Design an enzyme around this catalytic site. Structure first.
Site, PDB file in Angstrom:
ATOM      1  N   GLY A 152      12.184 -20.892  -5.804  1.00  9.04           N
ATOM      2  CA  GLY A 152      11.818 -21.090  -4.489  1.00  9.04           C
ATOM      3  C   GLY A 152      11.523 -22.533  -3.964  1.00  9.04           C
ATOM      4  O   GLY A 152      12.427 -23.429  -4.265  1.00  9.04           O
ATOM      5  N   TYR A 176      -2.197 -12.952   7.917  1.00  6.23           N
ATOM      6  CA  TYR A 176      -2.071 -14.352   7.623  1.00  6.23           C
ATOM      7  C   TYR A 176      -3.103 -15.323   8.194  1.00  6.23           C
ATOM      8  O   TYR A 176      -3.246 -16.328   7.823  1.00  6.23           O
ATOM      9  CB  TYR A 176      -0.609 -14.844   8.005  1.00  6.23           C
ATOM     10  CG  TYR A 176       0.361 -14.504   6.951  1.00  6.23           C
ATOM     11  CD1 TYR A 176       0.787 -15.027   5.739  1.00  6.23           C
ATOM     12  CD2 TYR A 176       1.222 -13.294   7.308  1.00  6.23           C
ATOM     13  CE1 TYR A 176       1.522 -14.685   4.865  1.00  6.23           C
ATOM     14  CE2 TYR A 176       2.103 -12.972   6.291  1.00  6.23           C
ATOM     15  CZ  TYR A 176       2.353 -13.463   5.103  1.00  6.23           C
ATOM     16  OH  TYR A 176       3.423 -13.119   4.433  1.00  6.23           O
TER      17      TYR A 176
END
Length: 397
Positions: free
Chosen positions: A57, A240
């Site tokens: 990533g 989040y």
């Protein structure tokens, strides 16, 4: 031995060695074209870089951008599983091999340390490596992707969970392989779960790396350190912002502030990046449908980015600009999710999520792009790789 993707419990169980390699090489090639002499001329450059979580990533992209973009020496840390003659390594293991090989082929100093980055044993190993080569770090990137952290002072293992607070979080989701729309839920976490998540996803280890490196005099004056994070769309603020992830983020942000106050010669930032397909994506409500819709909308608009596009932009247009500034938001965070969170983009995405059904998912959203990103992480569906050819050993690349 023919290696095809084996997916169960929304996890790709195996990996393709040459595919993982082609993936790294593709990122290297993009980097060479993106970070040119003109892009570098008149700006500062990183010289010695430490990347925690260097094998996949954003971490992998950060290491490739530093090394093959700017010619920097790099030490990478990641916890992988080696492969044997007949057993798969983790994708990150093949990624590290491909990276070290290309680095060597280019004459760049590169050293990969495989182990638990949360452990003092590994930290001690970086420290001794640095003192030998005479390295002081000027950029430290924290991109550790682990669901579990063994606390190094108490030995107890914590696992993060992804849950809201107070009220259960429910939303549409989608299987990119089948096309199935479902509704799944995440029930509110308790204190043990919330505290474990902060322990895993917060800034405790980040701070610990900085302090140990500081005490050993391995930080260059003006050293930049970054931790990657995510803010996301309004549809998922329950997790989040006000969920378990939101609490860990707040801890990470507070950690960044404290690092700046305690080390006057340092520049510490939380870097908020764009949303992409992660290992955990499938277990979160809304997220896989959000990403498929985002991908569709941004690819049509023309500003879709993967990991290497994101991070090269991070270096060239945040960290190493020609005006010498590092642009941040009101809370002193670096923002490269600015394209994603554009008003027109989020409006179109929301409309897409409202309209999606069973028969139209494949055509309305970018499930194909999602599948590709999912598979490419493990070295599958990579362009230029045969896949009908047998892999002789899982020991090389």
């Amino acid at each position: 031995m023919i290696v095809k993707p084996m997916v169960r419990n929304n996890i790709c169980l195996n990996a393709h060695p040459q595919g993982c390699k082609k993936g790294v090489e593709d990122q290297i090639e993009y980097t060479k074209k993106r970070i040119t002499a003109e892009v570098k001329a008149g700006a500062k450059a990183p010289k010695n870089v430490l990347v925690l979580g260097c094998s996949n990533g954003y971490g992998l992209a950060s290491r490739i951008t530093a090394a093959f973009g700017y010619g920097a020496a790099t030490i990478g840390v990641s916890f992988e599983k080696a492969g044997s003659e007949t057993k798969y390594g983790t994708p990150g293991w093949y990624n590290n091999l491909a990276f070290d090989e290309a680095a060597k082929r280019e004459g760049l100093y590169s050293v990969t340390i495989d182990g638990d980055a949360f452990s003092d044993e590994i930290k001690a190993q970086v420290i001794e490596e640095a003192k030998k080569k005479g390295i002081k770090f000027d950029l430290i990137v924290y991109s550790l992707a682990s669901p579990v952290r063994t606390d190094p002072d108490t030995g107890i293992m914590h696992k993060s969970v992804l849950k809201p607070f107070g009220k259960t979080f429910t939303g549409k989701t989608v299987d990119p392989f089948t096309g199935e729309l479902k509704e799944i839920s995440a029930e509110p976490a308790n204190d043990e779960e919330a505290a474990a998540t902060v322990k895993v996803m917060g800034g405790e280890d980040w701070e610990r790396w900085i302090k140990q490196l500081s005490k050993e005099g391995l930080l260059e004056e003006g050293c930049i350190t970054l931790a990657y994070s995510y803010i996301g769309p309004e549809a998922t603020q329950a997790l989040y912002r006000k969920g378990t992830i939101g609490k860990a983020k707040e801890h990470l942000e507070a950690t960044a502030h404290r690092l700046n106050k305690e080390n006057p010669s340092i520049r510490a930032f939380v870097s908020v990046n764009k949303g992409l397909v992660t290992r955990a994506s499938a277990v979160i409500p809304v997220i896989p449908l959000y990403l498929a819709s985002l991908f569709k909308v941004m690819k049509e608009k023309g500003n879709h980015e993967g990991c290497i596009e994101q991070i090269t932009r991070l270096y060239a247009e945040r960290l190493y600009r020609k005006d010498g500034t590092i642009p941040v938001d009101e809370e002193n965070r670096i923002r490269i999710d600015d394209w994603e969170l554009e008003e027109d983009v989020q409006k179109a995405v929301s409309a897409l999520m409202e309209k999606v059904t069973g028969e139209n998912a494949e055509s309305l959203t970018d499930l194909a792009g999602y599948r590709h990103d999912f598979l490419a992480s493990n070295g599958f569906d990579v362009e230029g790789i045969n896949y009908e050819a047998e892999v002789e050993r899982f020991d090389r690349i």
